[PDB]
Ligand binder design. Structure first.
Ligand SMILES: O=c1[nH]c2sc(Cc3ccccc3)cc2c(=O)n1O
Ligand SMILES: [Mn+2]
Ligand SMILES: [Mn+2]
Lengths: 425, 555
């Protein structure tokens, strides 16, 4: 197809790295049908072109439906390409995160990924965006395509588009200087303190700014811009470490407490267990009731107070990975911690009563991952790396059935049961 | 003759030049055969004589197929392959015949000869050049290069398939109701036309291909059921794989074993329990084709059990998308599971057998879960959807398992089927300490130089034991201590450990282990009526723990 009127930005892989070579995983019939339909139209619009097998690169593709959406959306899994793509700070098109966003009373997330297809992709980089639509039963060779335009989900796309996004948003930001806007991958986060009715009206004003810029570069362009997913981060809570309050303590209760306080002393150095462990002298039945001494009650009180204070020495470093651990607690409850150095937790939390509660652990864990990732984007500006309490094969069979986000974090699998579970229980 | 097909650009891997395996001289008759072969290839444009500025050379053997006196040329392109670019290799797995849907009319056409009818990228041809050696070692060698995809070159499958797809595209657009499935040599063409019209479309398809230089021989046009496509017999309402016969040899060549592994790889897609580990190990190294290898005893156990599975034909039916897919699973014991996928009862699409993934400790519920996941992924590949499952586990058993298991786990929509042996949970630990049950504090210790250790317990009743142990470790003594407490307690028992390792093993809920000690512990847990296991940190002043720690310290 035509050379685009817009001049491209040169892009490279990181020095010494080759492009992605990632196998396509098998897809359900409905998702292959959706992809064939989507890619046929994208090809007609010049956004992608068919390629052959002499292109040695590949990236997996699938399709998702957002919450309450009946329309399939293409989702390319560029996680490997993104790891291999140059950083865009040095080329001077990073995107900085606003610390005020998390304080806003309402934050609406808009899908603006369609805008990226209006900018061409550097010709020499296109080969690295190859993907393959597979066929049911290996009956036909997969249909191979590559991108001619900034792809959705590639970290280069918001970087290269930002100068355009800045022009597009300039009049809205001038007219609404207290509204905070943050772009992350395919999403626009728009935070205000306005009343929810007025907030929603401002989001629609913003949406119209984007469609009015749709006149100047016709590829129809409002497929998912329509959707408004609303957050209220000023009301987000943290789940602190709590100790039981009981009128009667057994040996087992006190053992549980000393174990928890001993673990917690790695996070809060002022924690003591000496007077509590003194209650446990001898060789006692687990269900024998032990009355607390004045000294043990004072040690426990002191410990409760230490746990109410924030952890010392914790600061977010955007050059370091964010890590998120998740524990299954039972009864639809899931705890999590986000940190960059062990025992220096930036946030701890707990979810309950999510989709799939009491019937589907994988769906619930997928939702937790999505919520934690959204929180992380809002609070710090990037996605964590997950440690998931699930076997690889189970997660990899099912997670794409439940995924509703246009980003995908990285993850690893935990197969040894952690004591951390009872501590955040 | 010139081909109308456009070539695919091909490159050597970055930084690499042409071949460096030079040309063998061979006997008088052998070369006598080659010039006849190559002269007749030059007659149809497959190869061309090249000039004096080509520095490349590629080796060649001469072998027979079914032994007439007419020699077949054998070229070992492994050298060219390692310097040839990768191609994105689009089909990893093979079509399964139960993924086919019923068609009123079916035709299978052969295009296996077509490799030699596809032009090779000109800038790459020079790297396939070879030399016919002199017949008396006096005159220069005749030098030819390939103009077409050579057999056994890494790019030929990818490039041939790509060329077919592009040639077939317009025809499929003109005929959106005809299905054409491509897998290397064979082309499957199915329609719901009455047979007279279908025959006409086939002839249109064949003329289309010939226009592009691709012929379909008249012999290998299959019009009678069974049509053979990719080794499957396609009848109108069922398919058959005939027993697969494997070579029987006194000594095995690398080409023999390579050809053997490829045959077993295909068969494993149809037959279950086919193993290829040990035979593939024999292909290690830079070993040339005519070169004899000895069979390990592992390799012959692998081969012998493969031939026993392959004794039997395999039959099945076709997919009806208007009906549910159903998958039923049975426990066969010793880590083995059987399954059937069907839509109507006893008319099987696919049957198979799942083996336990290896590991120290497992249980039947986990294995059942793995089998379900494996069948799910298989079914997505073949039919694009997840079957409904029929499982020999009671809904209450599964509910107890998944809700209490520390990891996320799930099984898609399923129903209980009462096919013994039913999968069950063999023990369940208490969530709270047991009133009135004796409390055993356990510990172990071992010297990491001598392997001498101790395991023991103390209880709130003053019962104590410590056993000296040889040839042990700290983690092993922790498990020994728990076993001692289980052996010497009543049917209800509280046990307090400081071993995260031992707690973690028991937290993983195994019903069988590679460790005889874990197995003995499992046996004990099964005999008990109630067991509560608690954890405490070592060396923090907790009374009973500190007493047993001192008991098991070295004296
Ligand atoms: O005597 C014992 N000492 C210890 S230390 C330990 C882990 C550790 C290692 C280093 C510092 C602190 C803590 C486990 C055990 C144990 O099981 N027993 O029995
Ligand atoms: Mn110990
Ligand atoms: Mn000890």
């Amino acid at each position: 197809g035509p050379i685009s009127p817009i001049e491209t930005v040169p892009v490279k892989l990181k020095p010494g790295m080759d492009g992605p070579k990632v196998k396509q995983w098998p897809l359900t019939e409905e998702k292959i049908k959706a992809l064939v339909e989507i890619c046929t139209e994208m090809e007609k619009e010049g956004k992608i072109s068919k390629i052959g097998p002499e292109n040695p690169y590949n990236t997996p593709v699938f399709a998702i439906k957002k919450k309450d959406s009946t329309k399939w959306r293409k989702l390319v899994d560029f996680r490997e390409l993104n790891k291999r793509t140059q950083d865009f700070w040095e080329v001077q098109l990073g995107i900085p995160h606003p610390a005020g966003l998390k304080k806003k009373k309402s934050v609406t997330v808009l899908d603006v990924g369609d805008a990226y297809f209006s900018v061409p992709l550097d010709e020499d980089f296109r080969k690295y965006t190859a993907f393959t639509i597979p066929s049911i039963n290996n009956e036909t060779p997969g249909i191979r395509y590559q991108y001619n335009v900034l792809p959705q989900g590639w970290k280069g796309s918001p970087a290269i588009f930002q100068s355009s996004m800045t022009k597009i948003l300039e009049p809205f930001k001038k007219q609404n200087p207290d509204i905070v806007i943050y772009q992350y991958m395919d999403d626009l986060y728009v935070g205000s303190d306005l009343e929810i009715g007025q907030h929603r009206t401002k989001i629609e004003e913003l949406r119209q700014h984007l469609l009015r810029w749709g006149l100047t570069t016709p590829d129809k362009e409002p497929p998912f811009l329509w959707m408004g997913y609303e957050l209220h981060p000023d009301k987000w809570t943290v789940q602190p470490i709590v100790l039981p309050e009981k009128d009667s303590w057994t040996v087992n209760d006190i053992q549980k407490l000393v174990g928890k306080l001993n673990w917690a002393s790695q996070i809060y150095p002022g924690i003591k267990v000496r007077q509590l462990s003194k209650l446990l002298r001898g060789t006692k039945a687990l269900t024998e009731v032990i009355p607390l001494t004045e000294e043990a009650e004072l040690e426990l009180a002191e410990n409760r107070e230490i746990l109410k204070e924030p952890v010392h020495g914790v600061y977010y470093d955007p050059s370091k990975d964010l890590i998120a651990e998740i524990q299954k607690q039972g009864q639809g409850q899931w705890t999590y911690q986000i940190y960059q150095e062990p025992f220096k937790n930036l946030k701890t939390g707990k979810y309950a009563r999510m989709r799939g509660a009491h019937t589907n652990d994988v769906k619930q864990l997928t939702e937790a991952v999505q919520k934690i990732t959204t929180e992380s984007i809002v609070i710090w500006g990037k996605t964590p790396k997950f440690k998931l309490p699930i076997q690889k094969e189970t997660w990899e069979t099912w997670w794409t059935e439940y995924w509703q986000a246009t980003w995908i974090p990285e993850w690893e699998f935990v197969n040894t049961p952690p004591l951390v579970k009872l501590w955040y229980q | 003759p010139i081909s109308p097909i456009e070539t695919v650009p091909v490159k050597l891997k970055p930084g690499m030049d042409g071949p460096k395996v030079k040309q063998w001289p061979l006997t008088e008759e052998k070369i006598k055969a080659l010039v006849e072969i190559c002269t007749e290839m030059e007659k149809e444009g497959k190869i061309s004589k090249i000039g004096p500025e080509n520095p490349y050379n590629t080796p060649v053997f001469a072998i027979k197929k079914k032994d007439s006196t007419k020699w077949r040329k054998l070229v070992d392109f492994r050298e060219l392959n390692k310097r040839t670019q990768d191609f994105w290799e689009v089909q990893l797995g093979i079509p399964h015949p139960a993924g086919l849907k019923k068609k009123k009319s079916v035709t299978v056409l052969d295009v296996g000869d077509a490799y030699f009818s596809v032009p090779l990228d000109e800038d790459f041809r020079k790297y396939t050049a070879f030399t016919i050696p002199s017949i008396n070692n006096e005159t220069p060698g005749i030098r030819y290069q390939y103009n077409v995809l050579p057999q056994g070159w890494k790019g030929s499958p990818a490039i041939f398939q790509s060329s077919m797809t592009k040639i077939l595209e317009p025809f499929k657009k003109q005929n959106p109701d005809i299905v054409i499935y491509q897998y290397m040599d064979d082309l499957y063409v199915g329609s719901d036309l009455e047979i007279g019209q279908h025959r006409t479309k086939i002839e249109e398809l064949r003329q289309h291909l010939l226009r592009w230089g691709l012929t379909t021989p008249d012999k290998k046009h299959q019009k009678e059921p069974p049509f053979l496509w990719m080794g499957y017999e396609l009848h109108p309402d069922k398919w058959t794989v005939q027993p697969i016969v494997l070579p029987e040899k006194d000594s095995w060549t690398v080409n023999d074993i390579q050809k053997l592994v490829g045959k077993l790889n295909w068969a494993s897609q149809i037959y279950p329990g086919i193993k290829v580990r040990q035979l593939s190990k024999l292909l290690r190294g830079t070993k040339a084709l005519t070169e004899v290898i000895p069979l390990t005893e592992e390799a012959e156990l692998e081969l012998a059990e493969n031939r026993e599975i392959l004794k039997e034909p395999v039959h099945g039916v076709y997919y009806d998308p208007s009906k549910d897919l159903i998958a039923e699973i049975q426990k066969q014991g010793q880590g083995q599971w059987t399954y059937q996928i069907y839509q109507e009862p006893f008319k099987n699409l696919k049957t198979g057998k799942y083996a336990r993934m290896r590991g120290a400790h497992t249980n039947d519920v986990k294995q059942l879960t793995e089998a379900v996941q494996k069948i799910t992924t298989e079914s997505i590949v073949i039919w694009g959807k997840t079957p409904k499952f029929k499982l020999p586990i009671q809904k209450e058993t599964w509910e107890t398992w998944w809700t209490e298991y520390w990891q996320a786990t799930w099984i898609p929509e399923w129903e209980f089927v009462n096919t013994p042996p039913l999968v069950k949970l063999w023990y369940q630990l208490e969530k709270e300490p047991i009133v009135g049950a004796e409390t055993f504090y356990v510990d172990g210790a071992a010297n990491r130089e001598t392997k001498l250790g101790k395991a023991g317990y103390v209880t709130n009743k003053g019962r104590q034991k410590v056993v000296p142990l040889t040839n042990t470790t700290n983690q092993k003594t922790e498990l020994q201590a728990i076993y001692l407490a289980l052996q010497d307690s009543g049917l209800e028992v509280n046990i307090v450990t400081d071993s995260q390792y031992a707690l973690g093993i028991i937290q993983a809920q195994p019903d069988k282990s590679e460790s005889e000690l874990v197995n003995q512990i499992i046996e004990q847990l099964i005999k008990k009526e109630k067991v509560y296991l608690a954890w405490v940190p070592a060396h923090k002043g907790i009374g009973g723990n500190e007493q047993v720690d001192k008991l098991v310290s070295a004296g």
